[PDB]
Amino acid sequence: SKPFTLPILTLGELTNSRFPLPIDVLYTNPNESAIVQCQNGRCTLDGELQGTTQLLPTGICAFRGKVTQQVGTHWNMTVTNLNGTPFDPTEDVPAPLGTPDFSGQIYGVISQRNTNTVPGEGNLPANRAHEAVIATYSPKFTPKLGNIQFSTWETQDVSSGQPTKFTPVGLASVDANSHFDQWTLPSYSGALTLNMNLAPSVAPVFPGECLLFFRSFIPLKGGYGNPAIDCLMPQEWVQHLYQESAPSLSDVALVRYVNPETGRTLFEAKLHRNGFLTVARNSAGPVVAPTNGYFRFDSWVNQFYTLAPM
Amino acid sequence: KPFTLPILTLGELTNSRFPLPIDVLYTNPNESAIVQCQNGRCTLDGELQGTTQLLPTGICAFRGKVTQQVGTHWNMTVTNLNGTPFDPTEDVPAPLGTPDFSGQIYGVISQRNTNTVPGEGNLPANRAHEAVIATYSPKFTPKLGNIQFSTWETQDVSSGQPTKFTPVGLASVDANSHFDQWTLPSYSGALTLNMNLAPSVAPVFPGECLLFFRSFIPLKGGYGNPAIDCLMPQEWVQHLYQESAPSLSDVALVRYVNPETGRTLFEAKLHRNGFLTVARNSAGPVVAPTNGYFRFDSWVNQFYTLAPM
Ligand SMILES: C[C@@H]1O[C@@H](O)[C@@H](O)[C@H](O)[C@@H]1O
Ligand SMILES: C[C@@H]1O[C@@H](O)[C@@H](O)[C@H](O)[C@@H]1O
């Protein structure tokens, strides 16, 4: 039986699995009323990706496809799998892997490199890129059906029928009107249709315990706010667990957040089979801990184990 | 502790020199330039070199603060990516993550103010705009803690506020844009020697050439199909760093294998300093099944003769 391990990486060496951002802090929010059911950064401890999760850091909240027509200014674009193959709505996933998993106005850059080349230009293609926003709560956001819409400030310099890439950067806004809610899933097929093939919701099932998140702060195109995105495990853990494919020997692994300098355990946590952490903590907010710290697998325990309060 | 490479197809790898997926394996035997990139550099026993760091989000990124205005141009002091002051006495070429090629790098500058306003709900103000960093410019001196960027925006950039550069692609590859992926920036300006560089790499055996992981990089406008070639993908850097396996010799023999058929498609030398060579004599992509990946075979020496591709 290949033993279970986590990579040895401080918070400053980890990245968020739900948006292309570094991890900034560990965070808890015991009194959260929302169901936590994100679809990116989902991976079982034995290395099975779930939801819309894929392995590339560059694939998180990215889209690939072709603009079909103009419809600020608005544009419709077909979306393929990120590897360029046609997305097959019959595959057992919620949406193309990499699709954003939260409601909001996602701000980024749309770029295009034409397929046709010009002989006068050494047989090279024309290009354009422009800022763009994708509203994931809109009824035109239907990645599961192979089509989404984005808007631009630019009014004309976007070409139909040409290869198109969305590179995410941040959020456009977090004002009331922008519907930013990190725990509200998009309707991947539109509002009249149920989401399918989701990774399951996660929650603590032990008194005194709460979810522990890896939190990143996300840039804003304008306006006021300090929005955050919380993931259940960083992208490097997803990648590592996928590589190792270690059998889970129980439903719950005991992990310790250790200070390598002093060799001391700062706190302990449960790492659950479906790929998320809980701690025994009675407050909300960031965890204040030495920047050299990281989680180390200790042993397999079970649902009856009582964590020492942080 | 036995040496390993991660098991990842090209479609599961990313470029260590720009935040892009790997598109193809590629050779260019007749390259006249010295290959001495500073990102994606890691020895086989897991020592990062040049300006290499572990975060995919850190590649060609900058953090710091705008100081003044001067297309509109802006001066920006840069810190380490973790926010701490960059110490020019540290033994690196420049802050880790700094771009390692000449060109006009296109991306977005974003800002989140330090001060908050009660009227506005005790939340800080924000702004982001397209920006371009010309790494060949005399104003590009990251080793001295200071760079310059330009924007189409003419005014909506604030001084003295935390600033982030998120790279997206190149602004142009026409002649006046000086894109040369193998020409290093002068991290302190042209009249100064770059220091603490990861070493140049080359085949030391007749009939061999470097093998690259190639990505195509987006363009803001104009014509071109520019590419960035890295010596090893970011995932290999991350994996080698984790395992810290001793290099038993100076050259590890690796085999590109088709997992379905078990067949070896070709073999390569993975050198101690962190790069591949193959026995091949033409420029262009390597044509190989999408399920293929490199697997560590054994250790050998500089004189081992590779099966021609
Ligand atoms: C509060 C304001 O928000 C947006 O309009 C920004 O572009 C401004 O610079 C300012 O930060
Ligand atoms: C060849 C041209 O290059 C730039 O001017 C782009 O903005 C145009 O859309 C076109 O691609």
Residue B115 belongs to a domain with what CATH number?
2.40.30.120
Domain boundary among B116, B148, B171: B171
Pairing of strands B221-223, A124-135: antiparallel
- Ligand 1 atom closest to B156 (CA): 9
**Whether residues B93 and B189 fall in one domain:** no
Asked if residues A248 and A22 have their Cβ atoms less than 8 Å apart, the reply is: no
State the Cα–Cα distance between residues A12 and A292, nearest whole angstrom. Answer: 8
Does one domain contain both B215 and B261? Answer: yes
Q: Look at residues B275, B276, B279 and name the one whose alpha carbon lies nearest to residue B266.
A: B279
Among A residues 57-76, those touching chain B with beta carbons less than 8 Å apart: 57-59
| Interface contact flag, B221 A83, Cβ < 8 Å | no
Residue A98 exposed, middle or buried by CB count within 10 Å (0-12, 13-18, 19+): buried
- How far is A98 from A188, CA to CA, in rounded Å? 12
Residues in chain B: 309
Count CB neighbours of B296 within 10 A.
Answer: 16
Q: A256 and A307 share a domain?
A: yes
A27: CB partners within 8 A, 6+ apart: A212, A213, A214, A215, A228, A230, A285, A286, A287
Using what technique was this structure determined?
X-ray
CB contact A104 to B (< 8 Å): no
| Residue A202 DSSP symbol | B
Q: How many angstroms separate the first and last alpha carbons of chain B?
A: 31
**Does one domain contain both B104 and B199?**
no
Q: How far is the CA of B228 from the centre of ligand 2 (A)?
A: 21
Residues contacting B216, CB < 8 A, separation 6+ = A113, B20, B23, B225, B226, B227
SS3 A12: helix
Give strand pairing partners of B25.
B213
Task: Determine the Cα–Cα distance for residues B10 and B8; give it in Å rounded to an integer.
Answer: 7
Q: Which atom of ligand 1 is nearest to the CA of B158?
A: 9
List of E strands, B60-170: 62-69, 72-79, 104-117, 123-134, 146-151, 162-170
Q: Is residue B127 within 8 angstroms of chain A, CB to CB?
A: yes
Q: Do B178 and B302 belong together in one domain?
A: yes
CA distance B53 to chain A (A): 9
Q: What letter would DSSP give residue B11?
A: G
Closest to B17 in 3D by CA, of B212, B208, B206, B149: B212
Question: What is the C-alpha to C-alpha distance for residues A271 and A276, in angstroms, rounded to an integer?
Answer: 6
What's the Rg (C-alpha) of chain B?
21
Tell me, yes or no, whether B26 and B148 share the same domain. no
| Whether residues B126 and B223 fall in one domain | no
Estimate the share of chain A in helix, then strand, then coil, as percent rounded to the nearest 5: 10, 35, 55
Closest CA to B102 of B72, B133, B64, B78: B133
Which of A146, A172, A198 delimits the end of a domain? A172
Please report the sign of the dihedral spanned by the C-alpha atoms of residue A151, residue B166, residue A169, residue B41: positive
Nearest C-alpha of chain A: how many angstroms from B205? 34
Reduced to 3 states, what is the DSSP secondary structure of residue B120?
helix
CATH, residue B260:
2.40.510.10
Nearest to A170 by CA among A59, A58, A21: A21
Breakpoints of chain A, after residues (C–N > 2.5 Å)? 71
B295 at interface of A, judged by CB pairs closer than 8 A: no
| Structure tokens, B1 | 């502790």
Read off the tokens for A113: 């490199």
How crowded is residue A116: how many other Cβ atoms within 10 Å of its Cβ? 9
Question: Quick one: which atom of ligand 1 is closest to the CA of B113?
Answer: 11
| A264 and A222 in a common domain | yes
DSSP code of residue A229 = E
Give the Cα separation of A196 and A52 in Å (integer). Answer: 11
B296 token code pair? 């560590």
* Same-domain status, B20 and B145: no
Question: With an 8 Å Cβ cutoff, are A167 and B164 in contact?
Answer: no
Residues A129, B221: C-beta atoms closer than 8 Å? yes
Smallest CA-to-CA distance from B148 within B97, B73, B80 is with: B73
- CA atoms of B20 and B23, how far apart (whole Å): 9
Beta bridge partners, A76, equal A69, A149
Token output for A71: 């419809």
Q: Distance between CA A116 and CA B225 in Å, rounded?
A: 12
Last residue of a domain, one of A172, A194, A217: A172
Question: Do A64 and A79 touch, CB atoms closer than 8 A?
Answer: yes
- What is the resolution in angstroms? 1.9
Q: How far is B150 from B295, CA to CA, in rounded Å?
A: 44
- Contacts B5 to A, Cβ<8 Å: none
Residues A70 and A163 in one domain: yes
CA–centroid distance, residue B226 to ligand 2 (Å) = 15
Q: For an interface test with A, give the residue of B13, B126, B152 to mutate (most A CBs within 10 A).
A: B126
- How far is CA A242 from its chain centroid? 16
Q: Which two tokens stand for residue B263?
A: 């067949």
CA B300 distance to own-chain centroid: 28
What residue has token string 């998120």? B166
Tokens of A171: 């959020």
Assess whether B194 and B223 both reside in one domain. Answer: yes
The answer to whether the CB of B267 falls within 8 A of the CB of B253 is yes
Instruction: Give me A287's structure tokens.
Output: 């965890």
Q: Which domain holds residue A142?
A: 60-172
What is the tally of structural domains in chain A? 2
Tell me, yes or no, whether B145 and B200 share the same domain. Answer: no
